[PDB]
């Protein structure tokens, strides 16, 4: 009886239904939520997708439904708990993706039974172990199989693919941990295969399997992020794939030149990713016949020459072009403007000389160019004013060049501008007062390590979308505009190493998402505003997440960097940055910006050092639970160290040196288990150094020049 | 009687014998040689300077003649008198003036034992027709190069040669036709073939060419072959090929990677002068025997110098000028330890001069560093002083600065110091050519050099060409210049030189080009400048690339050394813009006389020279430019100027010259640019030549000139 089976599913499996999705399941079964029936009154499809259901799934309880042909359980928190009751199965579509299944015997069962299965999606689970079983030889209908993003591991069986039914069209094995020699894997007849991906595994080999050439109908072949080695197959090999639209051999270990015979795909090829290998030479001239190519990604290779002009410019339909991290010298080719559909151009980290490309914007058509990225090159001159004509621009990155001169107002007035990134040049001038009023409401304004002068506009408050402001190591003066507190998406504010005066505006406490505040090495006076901690426990993560960054940790003392946006820049260029190459010891962390809290966070990085701030430390500062760096050194702070600082559980760096702090070191600091860099020297501190935690573990230099501190590592208090 | 034939040859054929090559004229006769029998077997009259009319029959009548050597003379073609058989095995009629190709048809029909024949460097005209007779089974060498053959070649021409042929040279003619039409036949024993420097067209090789399995040299240069270089398996047919030249054709596309199939044996490759793009394929790392690689005048780019060429262990000569190679000169190029000649001129190179070749674990063999018309910066590195084998350094048209290290001036074998169009500073050391090499060219014009020209220049007795114009030189011209008897060109314009024009310049036996304009010189015009007139001998300054910019304005433009520089780079130099109207002639230096010449170019304008014009100046018969303008010259214009037969430019303006214009100026047929304005000249304008058609500005500012184009003298 169907009513009974479904009741048995809700009680054994469902452990929590916080949305009451299954409140309708009471007593015909056909009116129940997610349940659909034939006219006979028999269940033929259960759909409980994205239902907030937590439970332990044993498919055998649901498969007992003799007429169940569709089962949708994707987007819940179903764990695994199979019993292998061989209840029999007539499923034709099954989607269990995005759960917490771990026992891969469910796949064995579904492939053994379920001889009418047409599409199965097991992706985005935690299915572990080896792949062993393929759909039963009696299954003659299966077309799509998605096993991607699980924990499959070890070697793929030599005949795993070939054993699949002839009707197979889609097979996705990406995002696992399977290994093996790719040349040993058989695709069998490969009659219907159109989509195949082994991306993001650990698959090796210097040869493709002969069998792969049998897949005459292949349309997307994705073998990226493995360890394939040798040279890319050439000769007549790519003639076997007359329908291929998307190919990726990216992020393997390929070397040599790009075979000219790869152009045999150019009748159909729409997407090509050969990035992240060790390819040398150029894109061969034969690729001029790639009339349908829309996305060409060749970044992170050793390519060189003039192929951007002699080849790429002759590709009419190209929209996305990435050649960063290569060895391409000369000046940016002008013919690149013959590409009238180019939206994204990434030429960062090459050896380009000359001036910035201006031609794209002054073509017979309104320019479609949205992203221009030419960081870490040798471009010189000034930011061309013609860029104003690229009304579609959303992102400009000219960082780490030798650009000079003012920033034309035609940049600040680009309507769609969002990211203005140009740090590590020699740009002069100031920030116009019409920012984000006549130009785009920016998300990022990153102009650190330039020669900018004047005051930060009070119209910076109009940039409500702002996520990241960096103006460090410029020559800005004036006061921090109190209007910064109107920026509620703002997460990172770096103004260190300028000559800013006035107070630290208390309005910075209204910056709801501020997690990184750096005002070091300015001329700020007044008191530490208590409002800087007012968002503690309320901060939400935001869109600053997911950006390339580097962090240079200086290791030369309190007298001897920091966070930088690092899209398209080689780490070598940072080591050789005159500022970085100075301090003897340097460790470069790098990655993508990521939050450590999903909600209810606090500030993460607070550096107010080398100013003239006076007064006492607001007790509220000690409640920033996610704060990792707190540098208040080299100021004129007075009073005591708040006992509330014992609540800085995440703190790693705590610098209070070179102030006029008095009293005792709070014993609750002994409970800071991650504190690895403390400095309280050059104060008026006295009394016992707390015994617990890491406080006894620091070099003597970090307690020096106080008014009678005692206890290890200093001489004992009982002897004085 | 053989003696009777040789005598009938001397008197009937020979018309001049200034060396008395035939004095004793039989086996005792010069060139005549016989067997023990006494039968003529070989007549050798090479390099004899004989003038005559040759009819090979008068010599083939010699029944036993097996060798004939008449190369290096001046024989013309003669009527086909008589008809005898031919027993020749070696025939050499090269470097003569033969015009009738019947001599080839006869040799190909009658000389059936002929092994090697050379008709090269003659004037043989008409179409190629006959191939060596099929009865000839021994002809191994046939050289018909450097003649005047024309029209299409017979399809069967090459294939109709017998099968023992090993060397055929058809180069240096004017033959046309699609290359695919030519049949090579079985091509069993052919090892060297050249069709170079003709007008062959087509986009396919003839299929029969693949039959030449034993080919060691294939030279197809300087034609109109079009398309892409054959790839695939084609070059596998030539497992012995040592030298290949497809240069100066119309090939386009990339260099086939499959051309690397020759790398087991290939020693010489010349693909220059086409429209090739990309780079040398990586597959070429297998070319362990490649000695000479020439890819100049293409459109190549990339780091293949580093990824490929640096891995070629046996290179000695590397030419990549006139390409699109950007970035710094790769340091890995020093891995090429046998590199003798390096030419990277006219690319897009940045960074510093490549000097690493001299710090190898062995003394470098580098003889020629040529990297002109690039964007190099910094200073001439001192590390170049360690390349003790350097003979030629060409760093012109870069952005170099600073002083020229003393280690350069002491390079013992140095001969050509060519670094013009930089911002180099300092001076010429007083120790030039004493501890360093005795130079042939010192070309440093358009720099910022200071000081004086050291008297030590007199030690550079090999000097052919000195250029220091547009510098900041001061002091006097050293009288020691007169010791340079091979000096042909001396350019010192646009400096601040003071003093006299040294009369010792008249001892420069070979001086033909002297430019001292726009200096601060005083004194008199030394008459000795014309003392070599009628005696000048041509010399080794011949055969050098040059450009001449004609301005239509001071010495702006003028003559420059132009090895490895693009004309565009001259058009955009302010050495063009100074005068608004400009035009660029270019070529190779060449004398218009073989002996008994005079000076060719003499510009002394914009100085303060006083006195009268030496009458002797009018006897310079090959002088094409005489500019004495803007000085303080007095006296009259010598009537001897009617002897300046070759003059094109005569500028005598802005002086204080008095008197009449010589009527003999009207006899100067090539005088197209005259200026006599701003003097005290008077009287009629000579009625001859082009003098009545010059603009009024060329006679203005004078004291009573009359006659067309001025108002008539009688009114
Ligand atoms: C193939 O075949 C062919 C034929 O066809 C060939 O070719 C050849 O080659 C050769 C080589 O060797 C050469 O010869 C040489 O040369 C040089 C120069 O060169 C340059 O030039 C030239 C000329 O040009 C002209 O012409 C033409 C035509 O004809 C044209 O095109 C051009 O444009 C020009 O024209 C111009 O001019 C003229 C005159 O004036 C006029 O007319 C007109 O109008 C105009 O203006 C040329 O040709 C050349 O070319 C080359 O190079 C190029 C670049 O590189 C290329 O592209 C090409 O292709 C060619 O190549 C070749 O070479 C190269 C190298 O360079 C190589 O790599 C390759 O492979 C090839 O080979 C040029 O551009 C001259 O210099 C020389 O002379 C020398 O030698 C002689 C003998 O023979 C003598 O007599 C003289 O004197 C000299 O000597 C020297 O050296 C020696 C040793 O070696 C010694 O002993 C002496 O002493 C001397 O020394 C020096 O140094 C020293 C120190 O050590 C001192 O002390 C002294 O003083 C001196 O300085 C020769 O002649 C020819 O030319 C050719 N031809 C043709 C046609 O091309 C080939 O080879 C074949 N191939 C194969 C592979 O086999
Ligand atoms: C072959 O098959 C493979 C899979 O096997 C497939 O590859 C996938 O391609 C995806 C793109 O098509 C890609 O997903 C996007 O990735 C973007 C960033 O990509 C870079 O970084 C990732 C991550 O790099 C990590 O991890 C990799 C591997 O794990 C590692 O190799 C790296 O070194 C690096 O590791 C480091 O960081 C890790 C993470 O912290 C850390 O764990 C490590 O320790 C280490 O430190 C790489 O994969 C890439 O190579 C790149 O380098 C990302 O930006 C993007 O997000 C956007 O899209 C998502 C959904 O599409 C949205 O959720 C998200 O919000 C973003 O949305 C933006 O764009 C959409 C439009 O698409 C727009 O609607 C949004 O509004 C937003 O717009 C933005 O711009 C507009 C202005 O235009 C603004 O207004 C907005 O505010 C926004 O700024 C994607 O998530 C995926 O990573 C990649 N997977 C792998 C494994 O490579 C490949 O495509 C197949 N190939 C073919 C040819 O078919
Ligand atoms: C901003 O602050 C800078 C930095 O000076 C800091 O140290 C000096 C001690 O020399 C101290 O007087 C000042 O309050 C800061 O803490 C000032 O520049 C400094 O000016 C002093 C004047 O006595 C000079 O001695 C210093 O050499 C000089 N620079 C440095 C690096 O020490 C600057 O004048 C201050 N004001 C403004 C508007 O920028
Ligand atoms: C903007 C935000 C999202 C950033 C980019 C976030 O992703 C990063 O993870 C930020 C939070 C961290 C990157 C590493 C950097 C340093 C690296 C280092 O030297 C450590 C020394 C010692 O051990 C104490 C802890 C230190 C200071 C940590 C503190 C956290 C960091 C700033
Ligand atoms: C060093 C020597 C061997 C040189 C390089 C030799 O080769 C060249 O041929 C020299 C002699 C001649 C090249 C052309 C040049 C110019 C070209 C020109 O514009 C002419 C204008 C007028 O119509 C008549 C005279 C002019 C000035 C002639 C005079 C002869 C030249 C200098
Ligand atoms: C199997 O289901 C998964 C999960 O629903 C699909 O992956 C999702 O694809 C959509 C396409 O719009 C993305 O928006 C989601 O982010 C993906 N889920 C992730 C990344 O967890 C997958 O496409 C399905 N299989 C097939 C073959 O389509
Ligand atoms: C600002 O300009 C200076 C001067 O151009 C840059 O520093 C010089 O960079 C060149 C080229 O790399 C080096 O040759 C010099 O040695 C550098 N130092 C000097 C001239 O003192 C500097 O990098 C530029 N700054 C930024 C951030 O790009
Ligand atoms: C965690 O944060 C949430 C919001 O992100 C807090 O819940 C509410 O927050 C709003 C302000 O956004 C307050 O007005 C409400 O009173 C809060 N609701 C409550 C407490 O039920 C929540 O307080 C935070 N929890 C902490 C800091 O422990
Ligand atoms: C080749 O020898 C023949 C035969 O002696 C020469 O022909 C005679 O030349 C003389 C002198 O010009 C004439 O008078 C005769 O009429 C020619 N014919 C005879 C003798 O039959 C011929 O001149 C010789 N060739 C050369 C180049 O000297
Ligand atoms: C080479 O021989 C030819 C004749 O074969 C000579 O040419 C003639 O030379 C005279 C001067 O002696 C001129 O008057 C004639 O006009 C020339 N004739 C032709 C047809 O050019 C030439 O002089 C000889 N050259 C030498 C011996 O160097
Ligand atoms: C001497 O140096 C100057 C300055 O570098 C050169 O002239 C400059 O060249 C640069 C690079 O092409 C141009 O951007 C400048 O506009 C030029 N003119 C200046 C700075 O006034 C000059 O060419 C050098 N000398 C020679 C002979 O080439
Ligand atoms: C052509 O030049 C030659 C060689 O210079 C001159 O003839 C000889 O000149 C030398 C001196 O170099 C004298 O010793 C000889 O006596 C001269 N021989 C003669 C004149 O036969 C010759 O005078 C010059 N011819 C001219 C200028 O017409
Ligand atoms: C002589 O040399 C000068 C100096 O180079 C050339 O022209 C000058 O070029 C410099 C470039 O630094 C300028 O400062 C001067 O204004 C230029 N013009 C003049 C008239 O001095 C000059 O062209 C050279 N002479 C000729 C005839 O070309
Ligand atoms: C698709 O699958 C069917 C059934 O297995 C097979 O016969 C056919 O050849 C395959 N290909 C196409 C293009 O239909
Ligand atoms: C020419 O080639 C043929 C065939 O290889 C051979 O018999 C003959 O000896 C060759 N002749 C010479 C002179 O090498
Ligand atoms: C130059 O020679 C050294 C020594 O053999 C070698 O290791 C290096 O890779 C060579 N460089 C190149 C670019 O081949």
Swiss-Prot record, chain A:
Autophosphorylated on Tyr and Thr residues. A motif (Cys pair 2) lies at residues 710-717. Its EC number is 2.7.10.1, 2.7.11.1. GO terms for molecular function: ATP binding; protein serine kinase activity; protein serine/threonine kinase activity; steroid binding; transmembrane receptor protein tyrosine kinase activity. One of its GO terms (cellular component) is plasma membrane. Residues 1-720 are extracellular. It catalyses: L-seryl-[protein] + ATP = O-phospho-L-seryl-[protein] + ADP + H(+); L-threonyl-[protein] + ATP = O-phospho-L-threonyl-[protein] + ADP + H(+); L-tyrosyl-[protein] + ATP = O-phospho-L-tyrosyl-[protein] + ADP + H(+). It is found in: Cell membrane. Its main location: membrane. A motif (Cys pair 1) lies at residues 30-37. Keywords: ATP-binding, Cell membrane, Glycoprotein, Kinase, Leucine-rich repeat, Lipid-binding, Membrane, Nucleotide-binding, Phosphoprotein, Receptor, Repeat, Serine/threonine-protein kinase, Signal, Steroid-binding, Transferase, Transmembrane, Transmembrane helix, Tyrosine-protein kinase. It is a single-pass type I membrane protein. LRR repeats lie at residues 42-63, 67-88, 90-111, 116-138, 141-162, 167-189, 192-213, 217-239, 243-265, 268-290, 292-312, 317-340, 341-362, 368-389, 392-413, 416-438, 441-463, 465-488, 489-511, 513-535, 602-624, 626-648, 650-673, 674-696. Glycans are attached at residues 1, 61, 77, 121, 177, 192, 222, 327, 338, 426, 497, 523, 600, 684, 705. The keyword Phosphoprotein applies. Receptor with a dual specificity kinase activity acting on both serine/threonine- and tyrosine-containing substrates. Binds brassinolide. Regulates, in response to brassinosteroid binding, a signaling cascade involved in plant development. May be involved in cell growth and vascular differentiation. Contains two pairs of conservatively spaced Cys (Cys pair 1 and 2) possibly involved in forming some heterodimers. This is Receptor-like protein kinase BRI1-like 3. The chain holds residues 32 to 758 of 1164 of the full protein.
């Amino acid at each position: 009886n169907d009513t009974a089976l479904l009741t048995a599913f809700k009680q054994t499996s469902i452990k929590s239904d916080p949305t009451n999705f299954l409140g309708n399941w009471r007593y015909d079964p056909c009116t129940w939520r997610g349940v659909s029936c034939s006219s006979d009154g028999r269940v033929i499809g259960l759909d409980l997708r994205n239902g907030g259901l937590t439970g332990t799934l044993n498919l055998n309880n649901l498969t007992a439904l003799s007429n169940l042909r569709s089962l949708y359980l994707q987007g819940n928190n179903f764990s695994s708990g199979d019993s292998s009751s061989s209840s029999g199965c007539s499923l034709e579509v099954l989607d269990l993706s995005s759960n917490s299944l771990t026992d891969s015997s469910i796949v064995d069962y579904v492939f053994s039974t379920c001889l009418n299965l047409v599409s199965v999606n097991f992706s985005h689970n935690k299915l572990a172990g080896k792949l062993k079983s393929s759909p039963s030889a009696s299954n003659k209908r299966i077309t799509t199989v998605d096993l991607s993003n699980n924990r499959f591991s070890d070697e793929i069986p030599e005949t795993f693919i070939a054993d699949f039914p002839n009707s197979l069209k889609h097979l996705d094995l990406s995002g696992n941990n399977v290994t093996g020699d790719f040349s040993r894997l058989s695709f069998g007849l490969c009659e219907n295969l159109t989509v195949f991906s082994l991306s993001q595994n650990s698959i090796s080999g210097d040869r493709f399997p002969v069998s792969l050439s049998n897949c005459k109908l292949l349309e997307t072949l994705n073998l990226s992020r493995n360890s394939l080695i040798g040279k890319i197959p050439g000769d007549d090999y790519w003639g076997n794939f007359q329908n291929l639209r998307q190919l990726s051999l990216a992020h393997n270990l390929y070397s040599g030149e790009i075979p000219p015979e790869l152009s045999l795909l150019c009748r159909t090829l729409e997407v090509l990713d050969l990035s992240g290998n060790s390819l040398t030479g150029q894109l061969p001239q034969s690729f001029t016949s790639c009339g349908s190519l829309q996305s060409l990604n060749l970044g992170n290779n050793k390519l060189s020459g003039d192929f951007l002009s002699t080849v790429v410019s002759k590709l009419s339909r190209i929209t996305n072009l990435y050649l960063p991290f290569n060895n391409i010298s000369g000046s940016v080719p002008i013919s690149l403007t013959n590409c009238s559909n180019l939206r994204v151009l990434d030429l960062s980290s090459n050896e380009f000389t000359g001036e910035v490309p201006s031609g794209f914007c002054s073509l017979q058509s309104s320019s479609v160019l949205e992203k221009l990225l030419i960081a870490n090159n040798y471009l010189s001159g000034t930011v061309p004013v013609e860029l104003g004509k690229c009304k579609s621009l959303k992102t400009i990155d000219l960082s780490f060049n030798a650009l000079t001169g003012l920033i034309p107002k035609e940049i600040w007035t680009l309507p769609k501008l969002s990211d203005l990134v140009m740090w590590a040049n020699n740009l002069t001038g100031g920030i116009p007062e019409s920012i984000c009023v006549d130009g785009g409401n920016l998300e990022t304004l990153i102009l650190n390590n330039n020669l900018l002068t004047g005051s930060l506009p009070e119209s910076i408050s109009k940039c409500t979308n702002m996520l990241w402001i960096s103006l460090s190591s410029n020559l800005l003066t004036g006061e921090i505009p109190v209007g910064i507190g109107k920026l509620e998406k703002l997460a990172i504010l770096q103004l260190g190493n300028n000559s800013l005066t006035g107070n630290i505006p208390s309005e910075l406490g209204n910056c709801k998402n501020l997690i990184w505040l750096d005002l070091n090495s300015n001329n700020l006076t007044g008191n530490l505003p208590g409002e800087l901690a007012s968002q503690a426990g309320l901060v939400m993560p935001g869109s600053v997440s997911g950006k390339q960054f580097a962090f240079v940790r200086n290791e030369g003392g309190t007298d001897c960097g920091g966070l930088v946006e690092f899209e398209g820049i080689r780490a070598e260029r940072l080591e050789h940055f005159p500022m970085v190459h100075s301090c003897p010891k340097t460790r470069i962390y790098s990655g993508m910006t990521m939050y450590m809290f999903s909600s209810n966070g606090s500030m993460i990085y607070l550096d107010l050092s080398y100013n003239a701030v006076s007064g006492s430390i607001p007790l509220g500062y000690g409640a920033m639970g996610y704060l990792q760096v707190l540098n208040l050194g080299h100021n004129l702070l007075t009073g005591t160290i708040p006992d509330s600082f014992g609540g800085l559980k995440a703190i790693g760096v705590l610098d209070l040196s070179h102030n006029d702090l008095q009293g005792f070191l709070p014993g609750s600091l002994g409970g800071l288990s991650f504190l690895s860099d403390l400095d309280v020297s050059n104060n008026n501190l006295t009394g016992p150094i707390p015994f617990g935690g890491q406080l006894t573990t620091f070099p003597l230099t970090r307690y020096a020049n106080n008014s009678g501190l005692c206890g290890v590592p200093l001489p004992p208090c009982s002897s004085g």
